[PDB]
Amino acid sequence: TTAKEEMERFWNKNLGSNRPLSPHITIYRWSLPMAMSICHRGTGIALSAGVSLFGLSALLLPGNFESHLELVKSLCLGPTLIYTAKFGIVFPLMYHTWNGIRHLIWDLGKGLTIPQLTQSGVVVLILTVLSSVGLAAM
Amino acid sequence: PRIKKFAIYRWDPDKTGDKPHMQTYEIDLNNCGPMVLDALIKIKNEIDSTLTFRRSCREGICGSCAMNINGGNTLACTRRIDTNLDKVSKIYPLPHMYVIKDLVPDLSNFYAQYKSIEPYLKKKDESQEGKQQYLQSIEEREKLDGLYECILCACCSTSCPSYWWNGDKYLGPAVLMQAYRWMIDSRDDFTEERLAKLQDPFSLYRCHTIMNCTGTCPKGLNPGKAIAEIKKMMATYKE
Amino acid sequence: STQYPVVDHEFDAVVVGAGGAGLRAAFGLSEAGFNTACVTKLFPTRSHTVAAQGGINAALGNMEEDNWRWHFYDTVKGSDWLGDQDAIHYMTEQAPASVVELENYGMPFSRTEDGKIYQRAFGGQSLKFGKGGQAHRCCCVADRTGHSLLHTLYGRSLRYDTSYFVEYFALDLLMENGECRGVIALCIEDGSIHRIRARNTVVATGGYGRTYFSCTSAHTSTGDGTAMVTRAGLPCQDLEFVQFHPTGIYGAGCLITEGCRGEGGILINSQGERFMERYAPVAKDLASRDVVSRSMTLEIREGRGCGPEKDHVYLQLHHLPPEQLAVRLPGISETAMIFAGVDVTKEPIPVLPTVHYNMGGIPTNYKGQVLRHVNGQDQVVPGLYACGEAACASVHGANRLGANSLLDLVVFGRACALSIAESCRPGDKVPSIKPNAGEESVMNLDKLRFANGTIRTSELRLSMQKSMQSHAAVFRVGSVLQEGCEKILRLYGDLQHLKTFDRGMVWNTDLVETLELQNLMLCALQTIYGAEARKESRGAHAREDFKERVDEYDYSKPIQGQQKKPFQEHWRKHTLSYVDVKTGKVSLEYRPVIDKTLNEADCATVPPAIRSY
Amino acid sequence: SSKAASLHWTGERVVSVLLLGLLPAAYLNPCSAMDYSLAAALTLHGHWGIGQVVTDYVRGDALQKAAKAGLLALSAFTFAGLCYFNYHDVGICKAVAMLWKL
Ligand SMILES: *Cc1cc2c(cc1C)nc1c(=O)[nH]c(=O)nc-1n2C[C@H](O)[C@H](O)[C@H](O)COP(=O)(O)OP(=O)(O)OC[C@H]1O[C@@H](n2cnc3c(N)ncnc32)[C@H](O)[C@@H]1O
């Protein structure tokens, strides 16, 4: 019996059976390293949606960009609400960027101990807030 | 007198249309060993002999008792019970596995994946084997520390979300660390083709460095770091 | 019985056991072209041999210069002259070849200055036939040598088309007219029953450490092969010989390796004195396992215990350099912290003599063939082999030498395959078993599945384990042994009264542990009765009414004009044990030890002598 | 064997560092040339990113097919859209600049 055959017999057995899956997300303990990886996917997906919506609307929608800015100027009567737009835009970008560096450092083989994950993770978190508040006011 | 509560995942395949449920047991800790397995054995022996689980060494080297205690994958024989009585220990089978019965998961696929990397020494000329001990220097040997110790308890792989969603085609940290174990063993002559085996999008490349594996290994090993070290060899080996 | 699906399997050879011995025999058979099935109740890596720690003895001569004949001498001297010298010759000569074989397989042995296999000083061993001091021949993978031995063996076994029956609990031997035809097994995964038939069967199921209340062995060391042999009406051997390892942890009774002492670790009493200097002047705390552990048990009696209840003794390590402890013993460094809350680098480990190894087992050739006893003569059981701790080629005799069992495994696992490969051919006629054979095993299974009695499985196991612990301990006397005997016998009648709860098919552990209990009891009965009959002190078996080592001659003085004692007037012989499965009666016999080696010219017979370290 | 997955992985990290370099470079030097390279680096990295998400979650035969083609469409449309924006409008750099001093 080969390794490839053992896998086919594993799947043919268990799918055609009434065996339940043991719970996974429902039961598993949340850790900072873990929560931060999901965020990197989330921020990734969100930032792609941003770029794609911005690009497609440069093809599907009429009028120039400055024309569309005059449309944002019209709606608004709010001062700090513009900052909230800027903070909400820049927040996911900064997060993904910093944590991206952390990912690239990992790919080099460095910083892969559990204590280091907590440290590097916290430094990323603190760096996001600062550069997000930092950029929002420009 | 000192009662501690345990919430255990139960399922009996022999009962007509039984579905998975939790069951509570209560144990005086003054008549019990310090480890979780001690409790499991005690409730098995004294309260409910319908409780089914894998165990052998009670020492943390066989890897039989791997399960999910309080949201983390470890060895029951090695995790001591939280003496805090107000809390209730939640015992679960290893995540995203098919449950044969109670806390006993079907590890058949896991074992097969181990088989598919050829976990043994390979030489280009094996006609001289069994007569001369192969030479390996102290330093060449240190490279195997933190890799050979692996118990195959399956705690790590079974905690990797990539291994949940893609357990069929993704090998997982346990098996991956072992391929690395043989890659850097100086006595092995098949390093390049061992790396060439991982040349697809699923076998190695479903790792996205979630690092739950290293965080959960009952033996203190670092499978994710070994994975990272593979990814590097994969990009740098020529021909 | 029509309520059970019976699946028939056809093989050239069956190996029962996927331990070290099991595997080596298993794939050794397939490597020689045999269509082999390996039947195991655990996944092969889970087998006890992972627990192994100390190492694997071979006279490689990597530290100082060595000779396998010196290793020979040490083993027979260790065996207290109950060791069969023909088997000991074969083993100690093969030792290097077998170990090299493993290193070539991939075993990650610790390394030396030269880059060769690192060898360790260990309890019982010497150079120049006792004269030349301490020997360094324990090959090791740091602290975890058994773990690695088992993994590389399992790893290797994947290269051949051996048919593994993983998590299958073998019930009985398929016996027909004095010949073995295979095994009947319960598939744990779905409750089905499998008759696996073969021309040859290899019983390699390891020891029965779980007959006692405190032991280093696993929950699965339940002597399942021994019980199979007993129920076949075949004899067992030297079952009273139970090794108490000197250094088991005080708490859960986990093994702390003899390697600690071999590296320079010391045994201490409540006074601070290295007490093993008072019991053995020459070898000190590196003496025989029976000598050391009995010295410990004695120090406790005098009032020199160590705990708040004064019942144990300290293993001191904190005097060895920290870097040595890290490279040599990281695995006990872990479990001392985990189980006793002890930093080895600062404090000593609480240690205690606890049950460890079974030198007794299934009687065997140096070729690994199971022997029955007919008319005071040895006879080979056709198609039946046994190796490892389950067996008794008596390579160990009355006391096993440290780091010799992992050797035993690899050497005799190999031997079993060779004895088969060289006697018959693959594809030979596999003998057809009777239509309804192995019936009584199934009927036993069914009655144990619905057992509606008064005493529950766990409670009877405890009664047995505690009773063996107090009646067949390190020291044993006539009175206490006799009370132990009729006590174990009473608990055998109690098997009728056992209560079982789980009435399912899939993974009925409640049921299997009850099969395990029947198995353990048969091992217990034979151990305790054989023990009370033996009226001498030899090896691990020490009597306090008969402390004399009783041989054919008085071997203290010259051999000349001595009256040689008749066979049934001395105790330098193997204890053969039978139990009538029904009444639970133990009737015993004896066969001689083997003194002649395989070749006198290459390895001279070592006659009995004054035995102390 | 042909080392396709390892090259792909390397390529991913190479454009990651490229994109990391380009954000400071775009701020310090906002120009026509930086606009296009920011469009290429941006859409590519995002395409390969969504690639992985599809690979992980899209269980199926003809579904793995569609999702991959569907992404390829959306990506191509995205990169064109950006290039159009660079050519016939103020381009990414200046466009952000205006948005921010709002
Ligand atoms: C207990 C112990 C022993 C030990 C040691 C450390 C510990 C904690 N360290 C050693 C060392 O460093 N050097 C050395 O030479 N010996 C050491 N020992 C002793 C030695 O390891 C043991 O004697 C040896 O492990 C015995 O191995 P063996 O191959 O004979 O078998 P096993 O390891 O006990 O495994 C048993 C196998 O048989 C199968 N089995 C058992 N019963 C059944 C039934 N019912 N049906 C089907 N299969 C069965 C098990 O599944 C297992 O595979």
Ligand code: HEM
């Ligand atoms: C210059 C700053 C950026 C850096 C350094 C960076 C880096 C990375 C890295 C290294 C990964 C892979 C991480 C892993 O191994 O799992 C990743 C994922 C991803 N990135 Fe970025 N990125 C940046 C900006 C962006 C932007 C602007 C977008 C918007 C299109 C984006 C979209 C994505 C997406 C969709 C993923 C997929 C998440 C996944 O791999 O599961 N990134 N990024």
Ligand SMILES: O=C(Nc1ccccc1)c1ccccc1O
């Ligand atoms: O971080 C997760 N995934 C992931 C995938 C790719 C890159 C980064 C993170 C993750 C963590 C917990 C549960 C589900 C998930 O998908």
Ligand code: SF4
């Ligand atoms: S790396 Fe750790 S968790 Fe994974 S199989 Fe090995 S011991 Fe188990």
Ligand code: F3S
């Ligand atoms: S938990 Fe995971 S995805 Fe990789 S880093 Fe460990 S295997």
Ligand code: FES
């Ligand atoms: S039972 Fe051996 S690891 Fe827990």
